[PDB]
Paper text:
In this study, we report on the identification of a distinct class of sirtuins (SirTMs) found primarily in pathogenic microorganisms and show that these function as protein ADP-ribosyl transferases. Members of this sirtuin class are genetically linked to a specific subclass of macrodomain proteins, which reverse the sirtuin catalyzed ADP-ribosylation. Moreover, we show that in Staphylococcus aureus and [name] the sirtuin-mediated ADP-ribosylation is dependent on another posttranslational modification—lipoylation.
To gain further insight into the [name] catalyzed ADP-ribosylation, we determined the crystal structure of SpySirTM, both in the ligand-free form as well as bound to ADPr or NAD+. The overall fold for these three structures is identical with a low root-mean-square deviation (RMSD) (0.29–0.31 Å). The models contain residues 3–292 (residues 7–10 are not visible in the electron density maps) and follow a typical sirtuin fold comprised of a large Rossmann fold and a small bipartite zinc coordinating domain. No major conformational changes are observed upon binding of either ADPr or NAD+, with the exception of slight readjustment of the loop region between β6 and α14 as well as following β7. The most surprising difference is the replacement of the absolutely conserved HG motif containing the catalytic H residue by QG. In accordance with the functional analysis, our sequence and structural analysis revealed the absence of a catalytic histidine residue, crucial for the proposed deacylase mechanism and found in all other hitherto described sirtuins and that may explain the apparent absence of deacylation activity in SirTMs.
Residue numbers in the entry: 3 to 6, 11 to 292
The structure:
Amino acid sequence: NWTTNLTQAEQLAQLIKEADALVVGIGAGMSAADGFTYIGPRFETAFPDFIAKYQFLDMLQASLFDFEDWQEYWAFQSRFVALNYLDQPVGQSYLDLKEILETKDYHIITTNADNAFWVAGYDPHNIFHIQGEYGLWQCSQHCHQQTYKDDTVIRQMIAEQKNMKVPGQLIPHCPECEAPFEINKRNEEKGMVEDADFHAQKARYEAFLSEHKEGKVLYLEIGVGHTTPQFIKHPFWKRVSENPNALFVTLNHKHYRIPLSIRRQSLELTEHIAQLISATKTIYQK
Ligand SMILES: [Zn+2]
């Protein structure tokens, strides 16, 4: 039962059923498993101009790049926001996971910033977007702690850009200091704008953790890579260490070495995330 000859799906369905609570951490692998990829034809088709100019390898590298000027920044980012936030369709793995989680006491933390939880109909009170969202903007000088949005301006930038530049008059500026807006994103050097809504999410996530310091708590980590381990992977390892009755189950095909203090509490499930979540749902619902 509560331990880390069954298939991966069978094992995962058994653990979720037996769990007292789930703390679910979701990264980029879950969206890639549903087809929302950041390398290969999806990127090449969407950004052939930028790829030819800069030799970008992938769409995540491109989204972090320090572009030539704000006209170029917004030409790239407007198209990036439409692809990954305004028009990205619902993912089946998100729907399948939701059907499982709605039977459980759970909370989600994600380093993703796409629309996936919203088009799949998740309750925003149960999700912490710790790395912001592509649909939001912040002052580029971080001059005050408020986020903004304007999807109509995004569509105008897509329609009116030419030659990798938005017209200068379309660039949006902060009302407080007149610096250009930028996408709400976290930088190592500058941090992120963290407004009232961000803190309300963080408080809900911290309250759920405080209620589940004991018991059969399943720390379920889905598609979380190496990029920013301080937000999900490392804190999950620490929570599992601190609660000897917790379990760490990671859906991943890279075999990151688990800390000694959680070796007896850890399981790696390597099967393709979409197919694994689908198979687990079918077992779980009977
Ligand atoms: Zn400002």
